[PDB]
Design a protein around this ligand. Structure first.
Ligand SMILES: O=C(/C=C/c1ccc(O)cc1)O[C@@H]1O[C@H](CO)[C@@H](O)[C@H](O)[C@H]1O
Ligand SMILES: O=C(/C=C/c1ccc(O)cc1)O[C@@H]1O[C@H](CO)[C@@H](O)[C@H](O)[C@H]1O
Ligand SMILES: O=c1[nH]cnc2c1ncn2[C@@H]1O[C@H](COP(=O)(O)O)[C@@H](O)[C@H]1O
Ligand SMILES: O=c1[nH]cnc2c1ncn2[C@@H]1O[C@H](COP(=O)(O)O)[C@@H](O)[C@H]1O
Ligand SMILES: *Cc1c(COP(=O)(O)O)cnc(C)c1O
Ligand SMILES: *Cc1c(COP(=O)(O)O)cnc(C)c1O
Lengths: 810, 810
């Protein structure tokens, strides 16, 4: 079909068909007479999986023989999405499989849609981990992702009567052909117990044991024959567990609950015992694996030369005291030596400055669950504070501020402070965020140890986020500049030479139109919703949070509706406004916001005077596989967080790479995207961080904006009086009261500039040539936002390893 | 090697090696550098499994096309043991696989020992179901075994300080290569709710749903290319189940507990709610499958022409009211028609007359869990009792005796009475048992419907129980009479021609000696216990129950020990006395019996005057795979139940086929074994059923035997005074008190005749030629006890189908 999808050679196609039929018969135990599309999906998956194993075995053997420094990426979340297409892309098998299936009378795209997402994450942090695995493999790093195999990932979202309902994500129901269980490599993890002090030191005794059983999933690099491993741990009861008889067997479930379900909070901290168990479970099992591999390469001086441990936020922070526990209690290293090793091995990435997201564990929980770790944390704290006191003598308030132990009604351990003390590098995830860390929440720590603090601006993988999801765009680029850009995204800068090329302009606009048609068709088929494919597709997809200001978008939509009703016969640029994302089940306001969006839709979409000029659609069950569909279809990307709140964003980058223009605040990576593209090619509006600070100083009074802006007052009166909820007039009272009196995120303060900026978007959309020229200037300057660039920086500046695009032999 | 194991052709061996290597690489994702014996076992298993699938697909397609009457064998237990060797035997692959593995540098016997038993049963009833599946496939019947896929089978038994400890049987830890999950064929099962009566009849509403997910396991016939299915159901929560959020997901465990664990009672009734859920779960899922297959072959007149349902005891008895519920409530048949269909479809096998084993469910449990079924049971009862009243007018006590509903403090449903009312055939499992049913517990029912009552004497499969476990014996037989006997066991009668053949006599004795050496070696290797391989191997293996009288064996052992101590310099025939079996976890007396056996061992095995003349060994963790080892090594088979208590026995048959002589009472199938072999070739002793009855009439007084038998008094004084428990003198007080005052099984009444009979065993063992001639007379007359004979009788006399030894094309 298209060149970037590879060759469909006769011998390859013949072999794929043979192996497909072999798996249908022997693996699935089906005859073609009763096989369903799902059976055909599994036959194809097993066929493609076979192509990984030689490379996987050879890669891991290569690491054993060459003994490179090993990189361990520890995360509680890996938001992997679907694996089939990504595997074909990275092995150059897509066209061959397409031809093979076509010859068997099957449509490969239909088969691809059967696969469940591996939804083992909430949003950006989980998806970053997934992009990072892809980039580490593509850059030939000896890297391992370590996490938890959740039986249930992020819930499936259903909308019922305009409200979010949650359904369990039983993603393993039909099996997972990508993973390989390794029950032979099961390891013990200890909980509870008590500490005995002997002549030979501390002993942690009388513990309860849970077993950690690993499942390995292959992670292929882009056409370099490197296949790395993601190892996810599953909890199992020991066989003597509780061992009337029947009840003891049933009670095995209690241990096995550790790996049952992903906590569904994005950017929020819930201090539950089960979450702490999950965090220790991952850490304890992973560290045993790390030490085993090191010993099989007694001298731990070389440990940091052979091992790097990257902490994805504070969630695996217990790695720091666990490494200390192993080195001191089990290996009998002196404390100072063990600490030197630990600091040189560990590095910490921070993802948010919102205080409610920070992990502060009550001491009483740690005392009960992990009594030896608590002792170690207290010793770390005492030695760290002794350093602070020597550097800043007499500064008693600094000692209180920097302590790992927080005083109050309930004493807590600040896990971020632990991570900073115990890591040689601390990074934020975009330039503005990294600067905020040094100036605000971690200022004291930066003053003590400035060398620790780095920036590593986030990125996205151009394999999933261009080649896989938008083959039409990938092909028209490849036609002009070849294929090298797929693993060297800075080559997109070559496209600036084509900004005045009439053929390239029409082809870029053509690809977008095709994607919009395809998406419009998907919506009609799966959700029986009709949209106008000639309208501007205005898209905000991300988790529902007050800081992300879906509410600001809502105010704009109502503004547009009100303007139409006031002047029904005036031309306006038609829009389809699409908002999607999941709310955390316990987050009342986020659930109310979803209801408001659907309620706006109910009014706008059925008003005959509006016609097809404005449609408001809530995209149900936003997830990686839906992102792959909607992002290539978008014209306008909404990135409208209050300045200083979105650490980076990564959705923003996906939109830029796929030919959408951005309306956004100077927040997170938006700042760098605008810098790369030129501010003239971005729709920037609203308060800067400095402006937010100035408002906080004099005090935010929402009433002032209400009093001064008639169009805004109308909207608030409509919300309050029941215009969007005729049967329940007070339905949205909580939203109104929040906006008027308790709005941490200053929605009204950016309303006027946002609406004006949106007017400029509409004006440009009326000129398709100039819209498309601006799009080209965005795509062409997207290169910095490849996760390959991000990972190269982690490798050189934190881990001390050199990337490689060299191919292993097949 | 040996002829009965088949051919090792060059092309076959080459292909097996190729596929073994393919599975090691692609399926297991291992290189040979790090592969362990367990990896090699799995590679071999997958290789052998591949040879089943073509035959499995072709067999099931054949049934779809030809549409024979289908036989559904419903059991809560299938005691399958290991599958690898059995599969090779039935496919004629054993020698080829042996050669293939040998050429790869592997020992196939070593690999076989890695496989876990599928221990999804307790003992005889579960093992009968397994033998029956093998025989149904060998006889070309369109038969399906339906049961539950327990996550944990019968517990692993450990002996600690002489006491039984139970450990969970986590048999699925490393995976099960034999089964194929069929999540696509998942069906709903309903519980709780209430009944609404409408114009259109009864409706069962407001139910809780559990999903039944089937796993299919292939069941190969002996060299006929027939592969039938065992379908086992696993419980799954629906995805909206309970749907704070985390707890709702965790609570899915409650539904999934239905299939978690096998209830470990042999011959005993525990009326727990979870057991009732298991029973309904199997029935409801299975019946949906049955009806679906029937409809895809509205007219239910033909249903009994196309379907037979065999109830393995009363455990799946709810099939009767469930079939009625479906036909009346869902298909809208009139009651009388539905009842005609039900009776003609169902048949019931009874396995015990012990009252404590009979299922009598409290009405209150059924009312809550299964309210519609209870209504149906009451209607069945009323109509049945109307028939009784018409046949026996005025016989009011007969109405009370025959009722399905039992009166008392707690009203109960007698499930056996339900099964008799609702089945066209009721059978016992040996001639004496079937006669007992008609004369005692089911006398009233026999008087009403004599035509219903049949006998089907049990049997064992000669594939597992001769060819697989005792290839040496199978070969020496085959050398004389060829191989046809393996599927036509009556051909063993030809061996009577060889009873005076010196070569055959030495070869039979040689095979036994080899098996004894091998077993002695196994015991030393795995349990560091040494035994004298020239001693008489005296074996009692079966579940520990008072009715089986392991205690009578114990008294004999102590008698032998006491006789040695009294006359240390007198010659006696050396014995190794081996007793093994599991006790139900809640059965105190059975646990005490195990402790007594180990305590006797502690004394006897360390007394220097005894030397190697007497050893007492408790065989730990008795299970199908251990039976395969110990039975071929046995000289004497102990089958010593109180007359009238062991419905059949099947261990007895295994011993007879493998060249052990039997010491036993005239109980169960022992009666028929003696009839076949000649009473002169069996060591029969003790009370007959008629003698037990006479003692019950005047009253059993154990004191009389104590007063009259000095050797018995000595033993009781030894037990009471602490001779076998010096540190805890009163340890065995409960056993003594039971024997003296509350012994339902009359241990003392058979003591004198048992000891005298044992003296005759020893006398014969001193003459190896005459011992072996008697063995030949037993092996030669074993033919009746093939499960092929049993199944042919069920087929012709109950199910209305003709067996076939015709081969399907490969
Ligand atoms: O996604 C998260 C936070 C996740 C989480 C927190 C606490 C839990 O308990 C669970 C998950 O932050 C995001 O991490 C992304 C990648 O750097 C950034 O691009 C986003 O700006 C940031 O909000
Ligand atoms: O094995 C059982 C009974 C099992 C059971 C009962 C109640 C539960 O709740 C669970 C299991 O009976 C055995 O069934 C065997 C085959 O016919 C017979 O050979 C034995 O004589 C008989 O004792
Ligand atoms: O002791 C060993 N001998 C030979 N190869 C080994 C050994 N340990 C690890 N390897 C190789 O390294 C791979 C990865 O092992 P891991 O890193 O311990 O998971 C294995 O699959 C082998 O190919
Ligand atoms: O509708 C049908 N068309 C063709 N073959 C069928 C159909 N239903 C069942 N079969 C065949 O019968 C086999 C057994 O199906 P089952 O008896 O319903 O489990 C299937 O695997 C097919 O080979
Ligand atoms: C990229 C992505 C995110 C992160 O989007 P932001 O706008 O940066 O919050 C969340 N969820 C999914 C499914 C994604 O693909
Ligand atoms: C045959 C068998 C039984 C039944 O033995 P009986 O002596 O008839 O009770 C029990 N358990 C196992 C493992 C068997 O193989």
């Amino acid at each position: 079909q298209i060149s970037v999808r590879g060759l469909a050679g006769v011998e390859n196609v013949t072999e794929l068909k043979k192996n497909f039929n072999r798996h249908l018969h022997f693996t699935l135990v089906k005859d073609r007479n009763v096989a369903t599309p799902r059976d055909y999906y599994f036959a194809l998956a097993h066929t493609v999986r076979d192509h990984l194993v030689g490379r996987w075995i050879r890669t891991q053997q290569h690491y054993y023989e060459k003994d490179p420094k090993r990189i361990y990426y520890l995360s509680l979340e890996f938001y992997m999405g679907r694996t089939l297409q990504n595997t074909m892309v990275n092995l150059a098998l897509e066209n061959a499989c397409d031809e093979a299936t076509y010859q068997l009378g099957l449509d490969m795209e239909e088969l691809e849609e059967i696969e469940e997402d591996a939804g083992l994450g909430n949003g950006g942090l989980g998806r970053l981990a997934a992009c990072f695995l892809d980039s580490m493999a593509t850059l030939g790093l000896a890297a391992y992702g370590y996490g938890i195999r959740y039986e249930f990932g992020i819930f499936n979202q259903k909308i019922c009567g305009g409200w979010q309902m949650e359904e369990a994500d039983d993603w393993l129901r039909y099996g997972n052909p990508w993973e390989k269980a390794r029950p032979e490599f099961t390891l013990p993890v200890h909980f509870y117990g008590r500490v005995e002090h002997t002549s030979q030191g501390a002993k942690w005794v009388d513990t309860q044991v849970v077993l950690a059983m690993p499942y390995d999933t292959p992670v292929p690099g882009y056409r370099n024959n490197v296949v790395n491993t993601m190892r996810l741990w599953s909890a199992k009861a020991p066989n003597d567990f509780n061992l009337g008889y029947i009840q003891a067997v049933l009670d095995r479930n209690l241990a096995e609950n550790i790996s049952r379900v992903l906590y569904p909070n994005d950017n929020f901290f819930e201090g539950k015992e089960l979450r702490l168990k999950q965090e220790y479970f991952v850490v304890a099992a992973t560290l045993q694996d790390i030490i085993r591999r090191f010993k099989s390469s007694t001298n731990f001086d070389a440990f940091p030369d052979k091992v790097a441990i990257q902490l994805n936020d504070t969630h695996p922070s217990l790695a720091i005291p666990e490494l200390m526990r192993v080195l001191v209690d089990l290996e009998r290293l002196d404390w100072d030596k063990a600490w030197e090793v630990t600091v040189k091995t560990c590095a910490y990435t921070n993802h948010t400055v919102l205080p409610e997201a920070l992990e502060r564990w009550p001491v009483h929980l740690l005392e009960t669950l992990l009594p030896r770790h608590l002792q170690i944390i207290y010793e770390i704290n005492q030695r760290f504070l002794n350093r602070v006191a020597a550097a800043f003598p007499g500064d008693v308030d600094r000692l209180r501020r920097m302590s790992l132990v927080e005083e109050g009604a309930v004493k807590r351990i600040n896990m971020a402070h632990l991570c900073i003390a115990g890591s040689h590098a601390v990074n934020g995830v975009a330039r503005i965020h990294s600067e905020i860390l040094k100036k605000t929440i971690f200022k004291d720590f930066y003053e003590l140890e400035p060398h620790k603090f780095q920036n590593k601006t986030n990125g996205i993988t151009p394999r999933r986020w261009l080649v896989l999801c938008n083959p039409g765009l990938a092909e028209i680029i490849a036609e002009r500049i070849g294929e090298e850009y797929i693993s060297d995204l800075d080559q997109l800068r070559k496209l600036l030479s084509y900004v005045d090329d009439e053929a390239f302009i029409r082809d870029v606009a053509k690809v977008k139109q095709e994607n919009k048609l395809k998406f419009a068709a998907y919506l009609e088929r799966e959700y029986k919703v009709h949209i106008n494919p000639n309208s501007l597709f205005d898209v905000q997809v991300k988790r529902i949070h007050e800081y992300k200001r879906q509410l600001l978008n809502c105010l704009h939509v109502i503004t547009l509706y009100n303007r139409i009703k006031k002047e029904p016969n005036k031309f306006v640029v038609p829009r389809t406004v699409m908002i999607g994302g999941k709310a955390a089940p316990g987050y009342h306001m986020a659930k109310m916001i979803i209801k408001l969006i659907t309620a706006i839709g109910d009014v706008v979409n059925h008003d005959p005077v509006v016609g097809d000029r404005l449609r408001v659609i809530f995209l149900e069950n936003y997830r990686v596989s839906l992102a792959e569909k909607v992002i290539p279809a978008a014209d306008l990307s909404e990135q409208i967080s209050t300045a200083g709140t979105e650490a980076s964003g990564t959705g923003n980058m996906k939109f830029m790479l796929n030919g959408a223009l951005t309306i956004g605040t100077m927040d997170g990576a938006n700042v760098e995207m605008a810098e790369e593209a030129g501010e003239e090619n971005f729709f920037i509006f609203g308060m800067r961080v400095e402006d937010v600070d100035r408002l906080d100083q004099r005090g935010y009074n929402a009433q002032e904006y209400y009093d001064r802006i008639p169009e805004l007052r109308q909207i608030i009166e409509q919300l309050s009086s029941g215009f969007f909820s005729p049967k329940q007039p007070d339905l949205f009272k909580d939203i109104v009261n929040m906006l008027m009196h308790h709005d941490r995120f200053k929605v009204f303060a950016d309303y006027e500039e946002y609406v004006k900026c949106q007017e400029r978007v509409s004006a440009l959309y009326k000129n398709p040539r100039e819209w498309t020229r601006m799009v080209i200037r965005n795509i062409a300057t997207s290169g910095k936002f490849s996760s390959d660039r991000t990972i190269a920086q982690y490798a050189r500046e934190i881990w001390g390893v050199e990337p490689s695009r060299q191919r292993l032999p097949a």
